[PDB]
Design a protein around this ligand. Sequence first.
Ligand SMILES: *[C@@H]1O[C@H](CO[C@H]2O[C@@H](C)[C@@H](O)[C@@H](O)[C@@H]2O)[C@@H](O[C@@H]2O[C@H](CO)[C@@H](O[C@@H]3O[C@H](CO[C@H]4O[C@H](CO)[C@@H](O)[C@H](O)[C@@H]4O[C@@H]4O[C@H](CO)[C@@H](O)[C@H](O)[C@H]4NC(C)=O)[C@@H](O)[C@H](O[C@H]4O[C@H](CO)[C@@H](O)[C@H](O)[C@@H]4O[C@@H]4O[C@H](CO)[C@@H](O)[C@H](O)[C@H]4NC(C)=O)[C@@H]3O)[C@H](O)[C@H]2NC(C)=O)[C@H](O)[C@H]1NC(C)=O
Ligand SMILES: *[C@@H]1O[C@H](CO[C@H]2O[C@@H](C)[C@@H](O)[C@@H](O)[C@@H]2O)[C@@H](O[C@@H]2O[C@H](CO)[C@@H](O[C@@H]3O[C@H](CO[C@H]4O[C@H](CO)[C@@H](O)[C@H](O)[C@@H]4O[C@@H]4O[C@H](CO)[C@@H](O)[C@H](O)[C@H]4NC(C)=O)[C@@H](O)[C@H](O[C@H]4O[C@H](CO)[C@@H](O)[C@H](O)[C@@H]4O[C@@H]4O[C@H](CO)[C@@H](O)[C@H](O)[C@H]4NC(C)=O)[C@@H]3O)[C@H](O)[C@H]2NC(C)=O)[C@H](O)[C@H]1NC(C)=O
Ligand SMILES: *[C@H]1O[C@H](CO[C@H]2O[C@@H](C)[C@@H](O)[C@@H](O)[C@@H]2O)[C@@H](O[C@@H]2O[C@H](CO)[C@@H](O[C@@H]3O[C@H](CO)[C@@H](O)[C@H](O[C@H]4O[C@H](CO)[C@@H](O)[C@H](O)[C@@H]4O[C@H]4O[C@H](CO)[C@@H](O)[C@H](O)[C@H]4NC(C)=O)[C@@H]3O)[C@H](O)[C@H]2NC(C)=O)[C@H](O)[C@H]1NC(C)=O
Ligand SMILES: *[C@H]1O[C@H](CO[C@H]2O[C@@H](C)[C@@H](O)[C@@H](O)[C@@H]2O)[C@@H](O)[C@H](O)[C@H]1NC(C)=O
Ligand SMILES: *[C@@H]1O[C@H](CO)[C@@H](O)[C@H](O)[C@H]1NC(C)=O
Ligand SMILES: *[C@H]1O[C@H](CO)[C@@H](O)[C@H](O)[C@H]1NC(C)=O
Lengths: 265, 205, 205, 99
Amino acid sequence: LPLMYHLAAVSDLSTGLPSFWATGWLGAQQYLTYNNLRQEADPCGAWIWENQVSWYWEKETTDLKSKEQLFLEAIRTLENQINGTFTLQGLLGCELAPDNSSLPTAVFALNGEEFMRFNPRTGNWSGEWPETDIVGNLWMKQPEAARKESEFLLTSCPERLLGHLERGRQNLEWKEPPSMRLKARPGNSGSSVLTCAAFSFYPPELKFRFLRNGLASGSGNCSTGPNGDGSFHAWSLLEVKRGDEHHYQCQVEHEGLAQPLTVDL
Amino acid sequence: SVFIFPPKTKDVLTITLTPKVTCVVVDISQNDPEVRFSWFIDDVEVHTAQTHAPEKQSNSTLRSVSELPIVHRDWLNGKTFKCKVNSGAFPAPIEKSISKPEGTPRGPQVYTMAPPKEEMTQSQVSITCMVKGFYPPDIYTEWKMNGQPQENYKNTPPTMDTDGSYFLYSKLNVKKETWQQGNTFTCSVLHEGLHNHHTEKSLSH
Amino acid sequence: SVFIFPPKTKDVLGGGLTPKVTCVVVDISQNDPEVRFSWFIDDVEVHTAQTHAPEKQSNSTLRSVSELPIVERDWLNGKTFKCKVNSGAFPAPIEKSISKPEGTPRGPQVYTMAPPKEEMTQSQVSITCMVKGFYPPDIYTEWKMNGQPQENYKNTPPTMDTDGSYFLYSKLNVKKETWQQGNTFTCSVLHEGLENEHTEKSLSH
Amino acid sequence: IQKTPQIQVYSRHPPENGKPNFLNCYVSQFHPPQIEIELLKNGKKIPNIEMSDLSFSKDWSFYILAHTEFTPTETDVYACRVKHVTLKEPKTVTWDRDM
Ligand SMILES: *[C@@H]1O[C@H](CO[C@H]2O[C@@H](C)[C@@H](O)[C@@H](O)[C@@H]2O)[C@@H](O[C@@H]2O[C@H](CO)[C@@H](O[C@@H]3O[C@H](CO[C@H]4O[C@H](CO)[C@@H](O)[C@H](O)[C@@H]4O[C@@H]4O[C@H](CO)[C@@H](O)[C@H](O)[C@H]4NC(C)=O)[C@@H](O)[C@H](O[C@H]4O[C@H](CO)[C@@H](O)[C@H](O)[C@@H]4O[C@@H]4O[C@H](CO)[C@@H](O)[C@H](O)[C@H]4NC(C)=O)[C@@H]3O)[C@H](O)[C@H]2NC(C)=O)[C@H](O)[C@H]1NC(C)=O
Ligand SMILES: *[C@@H]1O[C@H](CO[C@H]2O[C@@H](C)[C@@H](O)[C@@H](O)[C@@H]2O)[C@@H](O[C@@H]2O[C@H](CO)[C@@H](O[C@@H]3O[C@H](CO[C@H]4O[C@H](CO)[C@@H](O)[C@H](O)[C@@H]4O[C@@H]4O[C@H](CO)[C@@H](O)[C@H](O)[C@H]4NC(C)=O)[C@@H](O)[C@H](O[C@H]4O[C@H](CO)[C@@H](O)[C@H](O)[C@@H]4O[C@@H]4O[C@H](CO)[C@@H](O)[C@H](O)[C@H]4NC(C)=O)[C@@H]3O)[C@H](O)[C@H]2NC(C)=O)[C@H](O)[C@H]1NC(C)=O
Ligand SMILES: *[C@H]1O[C@H](CO[C@H]2O[C@@H](C)[C@@H](O)[C@@H](O)[C@@H]2O)[C@@H](O[C@@H]2O[C@H](CO)[C@@H](O[C@@H]3O[C@H](CO)[C@@H](O)[C@H](O[C@H]4O[C@H](CO)[C@@H](O)[C@H](O)[C@@H]4O[C@H]4O[C@H](CO)[C@@H](O)[C@H](O)[C@H]4NC(C)=O)[C@@H]3O)[C@H](O)[C@H]2NC(C)=O)[C@H](O)[C@H]1NC(C)=O
Ligand SMILES: *[C@H]1O[C@H](CO[C@H]2O[C@@H](C)[C@@H](O)[C@@H](O)[C@@H]2O)[C@@H](O)[C@H](O)[C@H]1NC(C)=O
Ligand SMILES: *[C@@H]1O[C@H](CO)[C@@H](O)[C@H](O)[C@H]1NC(C)=O
Ligand SMILES: *[C@H]1O[C@H](CO)[C@@H](O)[C@H](O)[C@H]1NC(C)=O
């Protein structure tokens, strides 16, 4: 179970985006949000009620104001050397060493593709691109830069994480089995399509299995998505021989379920 | 007839830009110009191209173009891009394929050279740049005065040297006065063999 | 695809050999050889030529070599040379004419540059000859040591400049040593625009 | 590189004509992030919809969730419509009661 911050900055403000925003993730669930306008880092739904130290959220906001500035700088220092709008993104976080410690991550992407990396131990930015030099040098040209950024990943990160584990279990251990529903549509010509939909289940982990006359018949084409409820939604499609609709069933596997679940039309 | 062209070295070497693989089809005396286009990356179809409605030239023959936006690494890592053009008129589909020219990237050594004494009399002088020992011959070179990309320069084509690598010269032209005012002239080079794909050398006095 | 070729400016300008309006033929399997030759210098066929028997190459083709002799007079009078080949046993045959690039001769300004201060480190170093603004592109360059012609040099192709004229550079490569210990390095140029169709600058240390 | 949107429409709980539910429009796999997303009811702009914080996967492509309340009926057809650069015209994905 990892702690991952998704940071981003843009140039083109034609559609109302802030200039820089961010979101915190504990496993598959968001617990944090931030942007340059609200100027503060705040708790997401279910985490609002977690019990934390008084300065926890003080700390997330101040640590994000730093990164905001490093990104905003890059954005302008780039928008000047180069022609054409940009999108700065970075993936900052950690996973716990199965022996209390950090397993950091820090990669940055520019206009869709990766162009830079940070080593928190060595305190150095790596990268094979022109932009890697522009941005990478802009930051390294700040005394604070390396130190802070590094402490964020090696000290703060693993800490906050270990604290959400202790004080957040109710949330991370939460389980909810899906509600299944199988159906048939006219599909192609002289054919038909079976759809196995899974409703409102938590751990996004789920295994669809098709059954013809009882024996395995495939996996269809799985697609999972968020319900916005904090839960997830999933479906699988299987085109079959028209008329034979009824010889098939659908089965699912999930932690919400003690045993595999079989559904019919 | 069909033609396949690789991306500009500039777009490929700078992440912020967009490298495109191009496929052009000429000679079409008005057949079924709805000329289909199929692209593939490592033999996998893709529907991202940007085909541009045909165009008649000064020969009554129709022409067409399909640009495929490409991911900087797909190129640098060796992926093969194929574009197959189809048409009823055509017997069997015509297909072309290209990927980055094989070979260990050898990066250039760059040097700047002032106008020659004997030239210090004419109205305009010549600021020269020697770019040598690079391979493959995929490269980019431009001039900048005080960091301002300039226009009065010509690049020699890359020329295979004796040892297999390539070199080229790039000549910036300017009014003697501009040279003498002490402005800075910079030779900028983008080659995949250089650290961060780039390097630059300035000159003054 | 077979295009016509022009004479080595070395020959067409005094030299020793005789200027030959060549016409190389390629694109033929190792079993379908057939490319006749009928040269018409101004709509008049001249059997003055010699087609080196239909030889062949590895990639299954014909390393064709048909050489027609001409006069330095003809070439320099906007007079053309048609390489009309007659073959009735070859799909898409060939045929291409060529004359001197009609234009007022324009002499080059030649200058020599010493290996850059920073190249003075490397094993070998580069001795550069800038050959500025000349026309037509038919030129010839080479180096010499005290008087000794050399092999270790390469010429960029003639490159069109912003003002129509042309330029190219010639890089001579030598062991650092050959430099320190002064020597005669001379840029020898052959163009129909210099005084006596030749000139040559020199430098040492 | 720029990428085209992955538009998928579906409900929160199994749909049953008449009764209150929630319509979701998941837009993922795109780049750049500037985007315009809207839900429709028989063609009109269902208003006051909620949108999740904009995020992205390990591949750096952006995913976002648009959702509002609604109640199915054999008549009313709902669909999602987005506008992005990779899109020549605005793509409209119509809801499939079986997903
Ligand atoms: C009607 O007009 C059409 C267009 O207008 C032209 O009219 C004529 C009269 C001309 O004089 C001008 O007035 C106009 O340009 C005619 O179309 C032409 O058709 C010919 C047919 O052979 C095409 O020839 C090919 O040309 C390419 C080079 O094209 C580049 O340069 C052009 C200028 O010279 C430029 O216009 C092109 O755009 C193109 O430039 C590139 O463009 C792309 C995008 O478009 C950019 O991204 C690039 O940056 C830019 N590059 C730069 C820099 O310039 C040439 O490469 C082709 O050579 C191949 O074929 C030869 C013959 O078969 C062969 O000998 C070569 O070897 C080569 O083949 C490849 O060989 C390698 C190794 O040798 C192998 O590894 C490959 O496998 C092999 N190819 C493969 C994969 O099979 C070729 O000569 C010409 O390009 C085209 N004009 C256009 C458009 O560009 C039309 O013919 C005419 N109709 C008629 C007949 O009446
Ligand atoms: C089997 O192998 C054959 C030979 O072996 C080669 O194999 C390939 C794999 C190669 O990689 C090597 O391994 C081997 O060389 C292949 O034959 C080739 O076929 C192509 C077909 O297009 C020929 O292409 C033309 O090339 C000329 C340049 O040729 C010079 O340079 C060569 C080295 O690069 C050299 O080998 C040649 O000998 C030649 O050198 C000159 O040679 C003469 C005498 O031979 C000497 O006296 C000279 O000193 C020497 N010059 C110097 C110095 O080097 C190129 O100029 C042609 O360009 C024309 O066509 C283009 C495409 O149509 C077009 O874009 C250009 O613009 C140009 O067209 C002219 O354009 C101007 C203005 O732009 C117009 O004004 C003109 O009107 C117009 N032409 C006209 C009149 O219509 C062209 O690219 C290639 O030369 C040939 N190889 C040989 C032999 O030299 C064979 O293809 C292969 N079979 C296959 C396909 O499997
Ligand atoms: C992290 O900190 C630094 C900097 O990080 C940066 O590294 C980049 C490679 C890239 O990853 C960026 O994203 C990142 O921000 C790391 O140390 C750096 O090490 C490089 C390698 O030596 C060094 O590069 C030199 O840069 C200066 C200008 O800033 C250049 O002048 C110099 O060029 C000459 O030397 C190099 C090799 O030393 C040659 O490759 C060049 O070709 C050139 O040599 C000569 O030949 C060329 C041929 O064209 C000529 O043009 C030149 O004129 C000629 N040299 C002469 C005489 O000038 C180098 O490229 C960086 O300077 C250095 N970082 C800095 C800016 O201090 C560090 O290793 C890393 N930490 C860890 C833990 O590794
Ligand atoms: C390091 O801590 C690991 C996690 O345990 C923490 O949380 C509670 C369980 C608390 O009581 C403490 O144990 C820790 O703060 C734990 O699994 C490891 O055993 C610890 N390492 C050791 C052995 O010192
Ligand atoms: C199933 O998904 C694959 C994706 O790789 C697709 O190619 C195929 O057409 C789909 N078939 C179905 C079940 O509709
Ligand atoms: C920026 O580069 C030049 C600037 O003149 C031009 O191509 C355009 O304004 C910009 N690039 C494009 C084509 O998007």
